[PDB]
Amino acid sequence: VGSESWWQSKHGPEWQRLNDEMFEVTFWWRDPQGSEEYSTIKRVWVYITGVTPQSMQRIAGTDVWQWTTQLNANWRGSYCFIPTERDDIFSAPDRLELREGWRKLLPQAIADPLNPQSWKGGLGHAVSALEMPQAPLQPGWDCPQAPEIPAKEIIWKSERLKNSRRVWIFTTEERPLAVLLDGEFWAQSMPVWPVLTSLTHRQQLPPAVYVLIDAIDTTHRAHELPCNADFWLAVQQELLPLVKVIAPFSDRADRTVVAGQSFGGLSALYAGLHWPERFGCVLSQSGSYWWPHRGGQQEGVLLEKLKAGEVSAEGLRIVLEAGIREPMIMRANQALYAQLHPIKESIFWRQVDGGHDALCWRGGLMQGLIDLWQPLFH
C-alpha cells in the first residue's frame, strides 16, 4: 500500500456490492509530493456531480489519500478531486458558504489521474466518469463501434457573426441532417462517432449527416446559444449551404434535427419555433429555460413569449428531457412542457435519473435521436 507497485494495480474508483440497492465506493489519489512529511496538501476534496464537504484522508506515512462513500447501484455521474493546501475552507462542521467554498476550490480541480474515462467537461476543469453496475443503459455508448471513415473537420469563418469556429461533418442519399450544439464536446471530449456508428449498423438510426458546431468559448456560447437569431441565420445561410457541398442531406424539416444540452437545449427549441421550415425535430436536454433570469423566481423569456403567443411550436416534434438531480432546471422544463399542452402529442417528455451532467446526457442524446427519427423506419 503506497509503494509504487501498489499504485500500479489502481485504475480509478473501486466499488463493492453491499446491497441490491447500494454499493460502497472507494477513491484513491496519489500525492505527487509524498508523505505528510514533504506534502503541502491538507485536503483532497471529492466533488461528485449531483452527490458531492467530504475530504480524503491520508494513510499516515503514505502518499495515499483515500475516501469511501456509498452510491446506489443505479447511479452514474462525473466527479473530480481537489487537492489543496487550504484547510480553512469547509472547516466548520451554509448553502452560501458552500457555493463560495466551492467557487474558491474548483479552480484547483483535477480529473482522476488513474481513471482513463476522463475529459475536459464542466465549468472549466477535468472530470472523471463513475458508473454503477445497475446504471441505466445508454444506447450506443454501451457497445461503441469505430467507423471506417472519419468525420471531416472544417473551419467555418462566419461573415455575419464575424468569427471562426471548428465544424465537424460526419456521415453514416436523402439522409436526414442533425445539428449538434456544443460540437467540440461531442467531437473531442466524448466523441460520438463510434456510438452513432454502432447504432446505425444496428438500424436504430438511419444513415445520416451530422454537423457538430463548435461553441468556441463560454462567452461566445453565452451570447450565441440563448435565443440569438443571428447565430441561426448564419448557420442556415452560411454553414448548411457549405455542408451541402461536402455531404448532401435531405431538405425535409420533418427529419432535420437540432440537438443541444442546457443553453444548447434552449437554442435547439429556439431554432425550431422560429425556423420550422428548416428544423422540424427538436432535441432539448436540461434546457436552460430560466434564461436570462438566474434566480428562477421569474419565468424564462422563451416561456413568456410562448404564453404571449409571440411564438408558436406547431410543425414540430420535440424531445424534452430533464433530470431530477437538477431541480431548478426540471421546474423550468415542467413549466415549459405545461405551456406546451397543445402539442403534448408530438413531444417526448422524459424525466430522467441524473443531473446536470454530460455523462448522463450522452445517453438521452442518442435515445432522442432514435425517437425523432423513428418515423423514418415506419
Automatic annotation (TrEMBL):
> Which UniProt keywords are listed?
Cytoplasm, Hydrolase
GO cellular component annotations of the record: cytoplasm
Q: Where in the cell is it found?
A: Cytoplasm
Q: Where does the Enterochelin esterase N-terminal domain start and stop, copy by copy?
A: 24-141
Enzyme class, top EC level, equals hydrolase
- Chief localisation class: cytoplasm
The answer to whether keyword Hydrolase applies is yes
Q: What is this protein called?
A: Iron(III) enterobactin esterase
Annotated gene: fes
